[PDB]
Structure formats: structure tokens, C-alpha cells
Enzyme design. Structure first.
Site, PDB file in Angstrom:
ATOM      1  CE  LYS A  72       7.318   3.049   5.887  1.00  0.00           C
ATOM      2  NZ  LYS A  72       7.394   4.292   6.712  1.00  0.00           N
ATOM      3  CG  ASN A  92       1.985   5.188  11.408  1.00  0.00           C
ATOM      4  OD1 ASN A  92       2.635   6.217  11.625  1.00  0.00           O
ATOM      5  ND2 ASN A  92       1.891   4.629  10.180  1.00  0.00           N
ATOM      6  CG  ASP A 144       1.883  10.326  11.484  1.00  0.00           C
ATOM      7  OD1 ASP A 144       0.747  10.813  11.670  1.00  0.00           O
ATOM      8  OD2 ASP A 144       2.248   9.853  10.386  1.00  0.00           O
ATOM      9  N   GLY A 152       0.808  -1.211   0.000  1.00  0.00           N
ATOM     10  CA  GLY A 152       0.000   0.000   0.000  1.00  0.00           C
ATOM     11  C   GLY A 152       0.836   1.252   0.000  1.00  0.00           C
ATOM     12  CG  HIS A 153       0.539   3.994  -3.016  1.00  0.00           C
ATOM     13  ND1 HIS A 153       0.163   2.731  -3.420  1.00  0.00           N
ATOM     14  CD2 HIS A 153       1.122   4.576  -4.092  1.00  0.00           C
ATOM     15  CE1 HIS A 153       0.495   2.557  -4.686  1.00  0.00           C
ATOM     16  NE2 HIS A 153       1.080   3.661  -5.117  1.00  0.00           N
TER      17      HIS A 153
END
Ligand SMILES: Nc1ncnc2c1ncn2[C@@H]1O[C@H](COP(=O)(O)OP(=O)(O)O)[C@@H](O)[C@H]1O
Ligand SMILES: Nc1ncnc2c1ncn2[C@@H]1O[C@H](COP(=O)(O)OP(=O)(O)O)[C@@H](O)[C@H]1O
Ligand SMILES: *Cc1c(O)c(OC)cc2c(C)c(CCOCCOC)c(=O)oc12
Ligand SMILES: *Cc1c(O)c(OC)cc2c(C)c(CCOCCOC)c(=O)oc12
Ligand SMILES: [Mg+2]
Ligand SMILES: [Mg+2]
Lengths: 388, 383
Positions: free
Chosen positions: A40, A134, A129, A19-20
């Protein structure tokens, strides 16, 4: 064409995208020693890796709730990171009608997240974040047990961190654990309500974070768990960063307590209050909220068998919280020698016994915990409170 | 101090537990995969190689355990079967067991459908019980499962004190079905036996003494279970339901299936007279379940909104049913305040009602049998 990408040790076939990410970041399924990983690839022009923090995580014990970055390697235009290959993000856990939670329940989950985060903060590291995406769910091990680990930490930004909706307000300098504890609060409520955000919809989220609008509409005032939870989240998502509870602090909280731990607390309190003056600051404190909690007279809102057997001993005031507390400690301690009827409008122990009372007195537990500071030390209460 | 007798081979030390009449069960090996082997005295139990071959000639069932091979030595018989992690006993009784995983209802569903597999082939179990219901090991990706076992053998009286049907003291599928009922209650009650302690158990079974003490009557779900359990374990053998008959029962229904019925009814009852047997029947138990007038036992917005139309009684089950079928079918156009007291759907919307009308579903299921044969109701009923 569709040929594999090496940059070894890391390797991955480029069609295996998982996934992006944000700024042109992508995450694929790859390979390492020979074990599977997820790799990633971040544009070194968009995201800034903090290698020293991780070199610090490795040389300090592993936490089972903070994901492992295996290695990282650079090609002429990209940064590649290999990390423990996981099955999903909170997002699916909560929002995927048929996700198969397997073992773990929301509260333990949050206990894991918060524990890992606490560990990060223990090393003066701030995530900056947190969000459903996450916070990841492991694949099942041999024994089949699944867990949760936080990710994408130490991976900062160049030319503001965080994601619209989850950004502590005071970030609109060097951040502090307070920020992450805000984001945490949001995820907490996100998990519990089963998808709802406290702020509380995509487009209005950040604006409403700035204004200070909450909802918490799922937490009613008549349910024990709703109360204990709200009491916490409301305080994590607080506008004032210096009001947000520390990391470990959130971990001692009533919210996570077993039923056994709860009832055990209820008792342990009572044993202090005997031989304490009612004019006294402690009991006066415990009785401040008073009537509301006890519903005027608690004797009038319990079972008839229980008020009969209590009746046989009087010395239970009924508008008094303390008397409701010893009443429990006794009906409990003498449990084996009880009548049977009375044994069975409660019972057994500890789970059904405690639930009887908190079911009837939603504000009981919360109130009692809040009252019984002043005993932050005592040598004994260090299990329910934090002294420092 | 290893022992062969190939293709089966086991260490005599790796013991997994003693069974009945001298039986012992070890952890061994078969092809090169781990298995469990049990050695029986041929003199005490009687294997039935015909039954097993039959099952093996037939499509696997995921809830009926597999026998890989069997072999006799001079003085024993050894059996190789899928190596499982524990029995229902631990699943229920072990405070920290890691479930992990799977819910009791689908668990009992699994056990039942397997059973029904057995009865499909005219093969009866005769000694069903927690110790003869095993939990698979966590699989490739961590899902646990439950399969029945120790079938296809016997004894040279079958069953176990605590689980034997009454008439076997003084067979057919009815016997298992009784043992099944017993297990259903054992599992739901988290440990309790219906009969309901080791010593008085068999006695009481002959006597007919139950308990079901854990099933309140004010809870939709208890009422549902109790209503079926009590029928599995019934004294009369002709009363106990068919194996897969028990698989169609409301006990196993998703929230969504429950709701779909509720609605699937209203759409039937409507556009028919009240003289009609159906409606008069549906209101038989009437007032008590709706609680005299249900309008007074529901949430405030919802009555305020249902005021605007009615045409709705409150002493009429059919009007509470219609209500659900409208308030649901228009969920979109509802006032937000109203949309919020129920919803989302199906789950929260169907619990809105069953939380307050415990006997509602049960009552309706019974009354509506009248349309057992109709195309639309086969998904709910049995023939
Ligand atoms: N360890 C992992 N295993 C599988 N997928 C992952 C993993 N880490 C990240 N991903 C996927 O990549 C997506 C976005 O990548 P990233 O930029 O790392 O996170 P985010 O979406 O949190 O900004 C995530 O939503 C997730 O689906
Ligand atoms: N397939 C299996 N895998 C692992 N253990 C088993 C298996 N089958 C039986 N057992 C063990 O054997 C014990 C008893 O042997 P068994 O012949 O089943 O007598 P019982 O009918 O009392 O269970 C059980 O407690 C169980 O732990
Ligand atoms: C219900 C109850 C209360 O409230 C209590 O308060 C201290 C004590 C007990 C005790 C001690 C027993 C044990 C039996 O004592 C009987 C003699 O009393 C005259 C109990 O069953 O319940 C309470
Ligand atoms: C609640 C409700 C009931 O009970 C009902 O029963 C006939 C009908 C409706 C309808 C038709 C709607 C749609 C809005 O209609 C307003 C009047 O216009 C036809 C509804 O929202 O709720 C009910
Ligand atoms: Mg991520
Ligand atoms: Mg067995």
C-alpha cells in the site's frame, strides 16, 4: 510505461491495483521474499506511520487475528507498506450475495475480530478506524480454513481519524479503547442484520451518531439471540464512553456462548440457589423481572408431556424463575431415566434441550446472566463473568 | 518398508482403512502426485475394466471419482484413485468436522447428478452408501466437493446390510435410487437411518418399516423432503423416480426458483374459467393448507393492505397465489410498513409465505403437473 516498481525488498507491477484508500492512498498486489503480498503506498504528506507500535507487536506473541506488516520502505515521495495479502473485506462477506462464507459464521468471525482487537488494546494501542473495509478475510489455507484479521492500525493521520459513519461521537486529545469499542459495536450489528447500520444510512449516519439515534430494528423481543445480541450492541454503541464494555469483557459475553456453554450456565446457577433464602438478595434479584420472563406461569407455555412429568413431582411454582431453573437442571440431570415421549419433546443434549427452553423463554438467558452477578467471583463463575 | 508394483507404489503402513472381504486401502503415489490405492483379492471382487474405460472415453464428471490406472500382481489387484479426505460417515457424524464449507442439499445434488451420469451410460452402482461417497480434499482455494466411488467392481450378494434394495434379496437403476433415498434421509436427519438401526435395518427394509420421524408436517422443508425421500425408497421398483428425474424436484430449488414458480403459476391460472380442470384441481386439498382462511394466518399490515383490493377469498389457493404475484409485482409501490413485513426478495418474500403455508408449495407442485409438457414448465418438471 507499465514497468514494475521495485524499492526492494518490496516490488509490484503498478497495474496490479487492488483498490484505493483515502487520501490518495493506493493498494496494489506485489511481491516480497518471493511470497505474494499487498503493498500500500501512502503519501507521507497525508498519513503518519507509527513504527514503534509495530516494533512492539513483533516482539510480543503473534495473534492470528491481527494482520502482519511484513516490512516497509521509503521512496522519495511515498511510503510503501507490505502486508499479508487477503481476499476481501467484511464488506464483501456481508454484502456480496454470493461470497462463499466458507467455514466461518458471523458470530465466530466477530469473536475473532474482538479477540484481535482485545490483543491490540492489551498493548495500549488503539485502532481508531474500524469498519468493514479494515477487517479482512484471509485466503484459504491448505486445510481450506478461512479467518479474519483487522488492518490499517498504527497508521494514523496528519492535519481527524476514522470514517464518516463509524466515528465514536465523543470524537467531535488521546483516544482510548472506548472508541474502538464503539466502532466494533457498529460492525457487530452490521454483520448480524446482514448489512444494516444502527445509525443507519450513509448520509445521516454521523449526524445520527451525534444525536444518539439508533435503530436496531432487526432485533425483536421474542427471539433469544436477538435479545442477547441487542443487550450487548446497545451497550457497545453507548453514547457514554465509560459505559462501553472493556475489550475482554465483550469476549466473556453470553453472545458468543456455545449451546453447551449456555445450558451449562443455566444449571450451574441452580446449584447455588438451593440452600439460599428467597427473602435473600440473590433469589430476590433473580425474581425481580419475574413474571414477564416466565410469561406469568411457565407451566402454561411448555409442552403437555413436560408439564405432566413435572406434575408428577410438584414443587415447581411456575410464576417463579428459580423453579423454572431447577426444573431444567432436573429434567436434565435425570435425563437418562426419563420417559421417552418427554425425552423427545426436548432432546437431545445439550443443544436441543436448551433450545427448547430459550425458544420459549427469550428473556430467560439474558435475564439470568444479568441477575447472577454478585457471584462475579465465587471462584467458580470466573468462566461466565470477569472478576477484576 | 515400501512396496512398488509400478507405476503404482505405496507404503504398506500408510493404511486408510479396511474395506469389504479382505480389501485394504493404502495411501500411495502415482505419477508423482499422491493417490489412494486399494488392493483387492481378485478372488473376492471382480473389477469391470470395460465400464471404466467407457467412463474415461466420456467427459469427466466432477462428482464421479477418477480411476487413474490399475495393475495386477501375482496374487492381488491394485487400484489408483483420487485421494480424498473422508467419507459421508464422518461428514455427518463428526461433531467438529469442518463442513467446511458446503451444504447438505447441494451435497446430495452432487451425488445425484453424478449418479445420473452413471445411469446415462447404463452402468449401475449397486453398492452405494456413506462409505462409498467421499469428500474431496480442500482444493486450490478451499472448496470441498463430494464424489461417488468403489463402483465398477463387484463380488465373486452385492450391497451392504442396511442399504440393499428389498428386491435384491427375494438389476436396474432403481436399486441405486433406493440406496440414494436412504442416504438422503441419513444426511438430513444428521445420522438417522430410515429403517433404521443396524440390525433391524435389512429386515425392516424387506418389511417396509420406515420412520422419517424427523420430518414434522408443520415445516415447509420437511414436507418437501419427505415427499421425495419416501418415493426414492419406495417398496415398489416401478415407483422409484429416475435419477435425473430426482434432480428436477423442488427439494433442490433455490428460494428464487420456488418463488419464480409460485408466480409462474398465477400467471397461468389467471384468465381461465373455474369450470376449467386446472383451478378446481388446485383447490382440491384447499382449505386445510390455507388454514381455512389464510387471511387470518398472515401478518397484519399485509391483510390491511390486501383489504384495499380484494376480490380475494382466503379459502382459495388461487387467491393466495395471485396475492403473492401482485404483492411481489408491486413490491415497489407497497406501503413501507408492508414492504418491511416481507422482502427483500426473493428469499425473505417467499419464506414469508412458506413459513406459514408449509403444504403450499408441495400442494401446488402436485396439482400443477397437469401442465407438465408446456414450454414454460419444463424448468420445473420432468418428461
Ligand atoms: N491485505 C489486503 N489485501 C487486499 N486488499 C486490500 C488489503 N488491504 C487493503 N486492501 C484494499 O485497499 C482498499 C483501501 O485501502 P486502505 O486505505 O488500506 O483501506 P480503507 O479502504 O479501509 O481506507 C481496501 O478497501 C481494500 O480493498
Ligand atoms: N479414495 C479414497 N481416499 C481415501 N480413503 C478411501 C478412499 N476410498 C476408500 N477409502 C477408505 O477405505 C475404507 C473402506 O474401504 P472400501 O473398499 O471403501 O470398503 P467400504 O465399502 O466399507 O468403504 C473407508 O472407510 C475409507 O476411509
Ligand atoms: C422431573 C423430575 C424432577 O422434577 C425431579 O426433581 C428433583 C426429580 C426427578 C427424578 C429424580 C427422576 C428420576 C426418577 O425418580 C422416580 C421416583 O420418584 C417418585 C425423574 O425421572 O424426573 C424427575
Ligand atoms: C396488493 C395488490 C394487489 O393484491 C393487487 O391485486 C390486483 C393489485 C395491486 C396493485 C395494482 C398495486 C399498485 C398500486 O395500485 C393502487 C391502485 O391503482 C391501480 C399495489 O400496490 O398492490 C396491489
Ligand atoms: Mg484497509
Ligand atoms: Mg469405499
Amino acid at each position: 510505461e507499465t514497468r514494475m516498481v521495485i524499492v526492494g525488498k518490496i516490488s509490484f507491477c503498478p497495474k496490479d491495483v487492488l483498490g484505493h484508500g483515502a487520501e490518495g492512498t493506493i493498494v496494489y498486489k506485489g511481491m516480497f521474499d518471493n511470497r505474494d503480498v499487498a503493498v500500500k503506498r501512502i503519501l507521507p504528506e497525508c498519513f503518519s506511520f507509527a513504527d514503534r507500535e509495530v516494533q512492539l507487536l513483533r516482539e510480543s506473541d503473534e495473534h492470528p487475528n491481527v494482520i502482519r506488516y511484513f516490512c516497509t520502505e521509503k521512496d522519495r515521495q511515498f511510503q510503501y507498506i507490505a502486508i499479508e495479502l487477503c481476499a476481501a473485506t467484511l464488506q464483501e462477506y456481508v454484502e456480496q450475495k454470493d461470497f462463499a462464507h466458507l467455514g466461518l459464521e458471523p458470530i465466530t468471525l466477530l469473536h475473532q475480530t474482538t479477540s484481535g482487537l482485545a490483543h491490540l488494546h492489551s498493548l495500549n494501542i488503539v485502532h481508531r478506524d474500524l469498519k468493514p473495509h479494515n477487517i479482512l478475510l484471509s485466503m484459504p489455507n491448505a486445510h481450506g480454513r478461512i479467518k479474519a484479521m483487522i488492518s490499517d492500525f498504527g497508521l494514523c493521520k496528519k492535519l481527524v481519524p476514522g470514517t464518516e459513519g463509524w466515528i465514536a461521537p465523543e470524537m467531535l486529545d488521546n483516544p482510548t479503547y472506548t472508541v474502538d469499542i464503539f466502532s466494533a459495536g457498529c460492525v457487530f450489528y452490521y454483520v448480524i442484520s446482514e448489512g444494516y447500520h444502527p445509525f443507519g444510512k450513509s448520509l445521516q449516519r454521523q449526524a445520527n451518531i451525534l444525536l444518539g439515534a439508533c435503530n436496531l430494528d432487526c432485533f425483536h423481543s421474542d427471539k433469544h439471540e436477538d435479545v442477547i445480541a441487542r443487550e450487548l450492541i446497545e451497550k457497545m454503541i453507548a453514547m457514554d464512553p465509560q459505559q462501553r464494555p472493556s475489550a475482554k469483557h465483550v469476549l466473556k459475553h453470553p453472545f458468543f456462548w456455545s449451546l453447551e456453554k449456555q445450558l451449562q450456565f443455566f444449571q450451574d446457577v441452580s446449584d447455588r440457589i438451593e440452600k439460599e433464602a428467597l427473602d435473600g438478595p440473590i433469589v430476590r434479584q433473580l425474581e425481580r423481572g419475574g413474571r414477564a420472563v416466565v410469561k406469568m406461569d411457565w407451566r402454561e407455555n411448555i409442552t403437555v408431556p413436560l408439564q405432566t412429568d413435572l406434575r408428577k413431582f410438584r414443587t415447581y411454582k411456575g410464576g417463579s424463575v428459580r423453579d423454572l431453573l431447577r426444573a431444567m437442571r432436573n429434567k436434565k440431570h435425570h435425563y437418562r431415566e426419563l420417559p421417552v415421549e418427554v425425552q423427545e419433546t426436548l432432546g437431545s443434549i445439550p443443544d436441543d434441550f436448551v433450545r427448547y427452553f430459550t425458544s420459549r423463554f427469550p428473556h430467560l438467558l439474558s435475564h439470568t446472566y444479568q441477575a447472577m452477578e454478585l457471584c462475579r467471583h465465587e471462584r467458580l463463575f470466573q468462566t461466565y463473568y470477569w472478576h477484576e
